[PDB]
Amino acid sequence: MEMEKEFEQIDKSGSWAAIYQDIRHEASDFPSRVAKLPKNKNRNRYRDVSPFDHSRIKLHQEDNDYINASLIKMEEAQRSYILTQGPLPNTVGHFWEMVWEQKSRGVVMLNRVMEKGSLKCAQYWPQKEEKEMIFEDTNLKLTLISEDIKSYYTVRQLELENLTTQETREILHFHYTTWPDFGVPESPASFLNFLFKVRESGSLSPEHGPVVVHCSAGIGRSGTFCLADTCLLLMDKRKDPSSVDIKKVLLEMRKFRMGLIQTADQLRFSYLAVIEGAKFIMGD
Numbered sequence: 001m002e003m004e005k006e007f008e009q010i011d012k013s014g015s016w017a018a019i020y021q022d023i024r025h026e027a028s029d030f031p032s033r034v035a036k037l038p039k040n041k042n043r044n045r046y047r048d049v050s051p052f053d054h055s056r057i058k059l060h061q062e063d064n065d066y067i068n069a070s071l072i073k074m075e076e077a078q079r080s081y082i083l084t085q086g087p088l089p090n091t092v093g094h095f096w097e098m099v100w101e102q103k104s105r106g107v108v109m110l111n112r113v114m115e116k117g118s119l120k121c122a123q124y125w126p127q128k129e130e131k132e133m134i135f136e137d138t139n140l141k142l143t144l145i146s147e148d149i150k151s152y153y154t155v156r157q158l159e160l161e162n163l164t165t166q167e168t169r170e171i172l173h174f175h176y177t178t179w180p181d182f183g184v185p186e187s188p189a190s191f192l193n194f195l196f197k198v199r200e201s202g203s204l205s206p207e208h209g210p211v212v213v214h215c216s217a218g219i220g221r222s223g224t225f226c227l228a229d230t231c232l233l234l235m236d237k238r239k240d241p242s243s244v245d246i247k248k249v250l251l252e253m254r255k256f257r258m259g260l261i262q263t264a265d266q267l268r269f270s271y272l273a274v275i276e277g278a279k280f281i282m283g284d
Ligand SMILES: CC[C@@H]1[C@@H](O)c2ccccc2S(=O)(=O)N1CC(=O)OC
Pocket: 010, 011, 013, 014, 015, 016, 017, 018, 264, 265, 268
């Protein structure tokens, strides 16, 4: 069923909550035993948001391989994403170890460091060229190369150096700065413009490791970004763009990380973004 008609049918009836709870009920339940080990309590931001064992990213070290991060692998769309929490004071070195080890070319940040008067993630990148950051626990150096500030987002160029081998790489930091403290954006126009800038950079392409995507918990806004990107790619690839079922794609993604899309309002916003984005994909 064409999703734009499904959309008006749910709106006219106010059945967004009904549909959302049906997704919650049908979602996968897999073990997260590594996340719950006592040695990992200060590596988790939220007690109720954990990576499944089968899909978690492992750090390449013998001491403790744990990070709150999941590999979302979309087989038909041929896209992969790493979804992670906003880094904590004691996991900023782990975060950059993961970007290094997974060969990622882009980091996508969908939150502000402070929202609602509380800290939602560590200040994990340098704000001035001449004040670089060293992560002594993982042996990495991170330098700000350039910054481009726009009305709805900021793009940064970072140099990450593996201090062990003196190898360096160019990492693109895509920072969506205008998601409101409460609710979802009224229009998906600036979120879709942002998604298209990440695509244009090569960060989502198969010649690189998976993009790292985060918000505060790494399930709500982060879920909206990967769900919109995969649905639009499937519309481009298939003979019938009307066959793409956003609820079935979201349940496939929930096989790899719990809780993706946190509210009925985020589910409606994801439908709006895909419907408006398709009016480019189909040739405009
Ligand atoms: C949880 C709120 C949700 C909301 O997304 C919405 C927004 C615009 C128009 C309709 C609806 S809704 O009616 O489907 N709805 C359920 C509702 O009101 O409580 C049962």
